[PDB]
Fold this sequence. Notes:
This is part of a larger assembly, with chains A (47 residues), B (55 residues) and C (128 residues).
Chain A (H helix, E strand, L loop, with lengths): L7 H4 L2 H31 L3
Chain B lengths: L2 H52 L1
Chain C lengths: L7 E4 L5 H13 L13 H9 L13 E4 L13 H9 L8 H5 L25
Parallel strand pairs in C: 1-2
Protein name (chain C): ATP synthase F(1) complex subunit alpha, mitochondrial
Family (chain C): Belongs to the ATPase alpha/beta chains family.
Organism (chain C): Bos taurus (Bovine)
Amino acid sequence: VRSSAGAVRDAGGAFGKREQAEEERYFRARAKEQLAALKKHHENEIS
Amino acid sequence: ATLKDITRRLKSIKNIQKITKSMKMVAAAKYARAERELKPARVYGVGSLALYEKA
Amino acid sequence: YFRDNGKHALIIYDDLSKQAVAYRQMSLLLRRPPGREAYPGDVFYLHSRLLERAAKMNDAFGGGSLTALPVIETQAGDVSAYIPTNVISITDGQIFLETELFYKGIRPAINVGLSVSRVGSAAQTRAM
């Protein structure tokens, strides 16, 4: 019996949900930052 | 549980063990470097504290 | 009878996992060869022919309807078992109740993440 890549999130135990959340929070933060930058660029490029 | 539940759990724990072994090795290397750099900084900081404990 | 006479009915089989056991006992005592987990071969049919009678007649046939709410019982959440999977592939929606949610304080334990309903949009009031 072996182990394969992407198995922690295949089991779906506690580590799977923990990893999913650790990813989602970080990328929500980065999406917020990128959206702020996109708004700034929009405003600065109207003229 | 059933056989598939056990198989998935076993695979996940095996991955976790691999990752923790790798991280132990990385931390050990960084520790060796940190001690090496800590000796001179130890003497430097102790000297900088010298005054207050002397006066 | 109700759905054929223009009226509406709701039926609640509780459980179907025990009708399956009674059918298995009958079939084993008639000497019919067993199948998987000792259930007869015709154990899907047993339920499919039963849950297919919950129809929604058009207005030409009275307009009556017969909703069905079969109740299955899994073993330690093993939805992957035999009768659970049969009935899940027979029915339209599902309502997953979980003990981890029952004890965590969420009652009814409905696992909204997995619970499904094919009709969805339709069969819902506009405010809801």
